[PDB]
Amino acid sequence: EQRAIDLYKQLKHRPSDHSYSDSTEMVKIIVHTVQSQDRVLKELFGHLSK
Amino acid sequence: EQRAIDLYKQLKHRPSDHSYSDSTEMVKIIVHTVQSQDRVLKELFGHLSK
Ligand SMILES: O=S(=O)(O)O[C@@H]1[C@@H](O)[C@H](OS(=O)(=O)O)[C@@H](CO[C@H]2O[C@H](CO[C@H]3O[C@H](CO)[C@@H](O)[C@H](OS(=O)(=O)O)[C@H]3OS(=O)(=O)O)[C@@H](O)[C@H](O)[C@H]2O)O[C@@H]1O
Ligand SMILES: O=S(=O)(O)O[C@@H]1[C@@H](O)[C@H](OS(=O)(=O)O)[C@@H](CO[C@H]2O[C@H](CO[C@H]3O[C@H](CO)[C@@H](O)[C@H](OS(=O)(=O)O)[C@H]3OS(=O)(=O)O)[C@@H](O)[C@H](O)[C@H]2O)O[C@@H]1O
């Protein structure tokens, strides 16, 4: 979470804007959160089944 | 050549734009290429005359 925040932070506070073209970096935080989600997600249900 | 490329590269990929005012740096690569050109240019013709 904090990661994504840092990116959105470096999106406005970055040396000016209205021209910055990029987005590949965000992909990082994006993919990771997904993997982590589904992992502990169904995992939580497991420790709940008991 | 690679030099100039690096400058044009730091012209778009640089931290945003739509205001960045500068051009003195490019002068560098510009002048150098000219000198080198005319030097080996007529130089090539010399090694060709033979
Ligand atoms: O430096 S780059 O940006 O070019 O590449 C990054 C890597 O350097 C970085 O590895 S490291 O330097 O942190 O050691 C990784 C990891 O970043 C964080 O996010 C991953 C997310 O990984 C999830 O998805 C991958 C898919 O291949 C799985 O292999 C992970 O499983 S495992 O390896 O953790 O067992 C999976 O993790 S998850 O199940 O918890 O979601 C985290 O795993 C890392 O711990 C984080 O540091 O990011 C770029 O690739
Ligand atoms: O010494 S500092 O770091 O403080 O400042 C450097 C300057 O001294 C340097 O100027 S200079 O010493 O090279 O003349 C500049 C520019 O260097 C870059 O270009 C040279 C190649 O020089 C070419 O352009 C100069 C321009 O005056 C010509 O005089 C050269 O022709 S000649 O005098 O050799 O006959 C010309 O050489 S060339 O025909 O072979 O192209 C490169 O060697 C450097 O690597 C470049 O940085 O850089 C600092 O400001």
- What does this entry list as its resolution, in Å? 4.5
Please give the full DSSP string across B26-46, using - where no structure is assigned: HHHHHHHHHHHHHHHHHHHHH
Discontinuities after residues in chain B (C–N over 2.5 A): none
**Ligand 2 shell residues, CB under 6 Å:** B 31-32, 35-36, 39
Determine the Cα–Cα distance for residues A23 and A7; give it in Å rounded to an integer.
10
Residue B3 near residue B29, CB atoms below 8 Å: yes
CA B43 → CA B1, B38, B48, distances in Å? 20, 8, 9
Token readout for A34 is: 């997904």
Cα distance between residue A50 and residue B4, in whole Å = 66
Handedness of CA A11, A16, A18, A24 (dihedral sign): negative
Question: From the CA of A32, how far away is ligand 1's center (Å)?
Answer: 7
**Chain length of chain B:** 50
Rounded Cα distance between A48 and A43, Å, is 9
B22 part of contact set with chain A, CB < 8 Å: no
User: How crowded is the C-beta side of B29, counted as CA atoms within 13 Å?
Assistant: 11
Q: Rg for chain A (alpha carbons), in Å? A: 16
3-state secondary structure of B24: helix
Token pair in block for residue A4: 């994504």
Residues A17, A9: Cα–Cα separation, whole Å: 12
Distance CA B42, CA B35 (A): 12
Method: X-ray
Helices (H), A1-50: 2-12, 24-49
| Cα distance between residue B6 and residue A34, in whole Å | 36
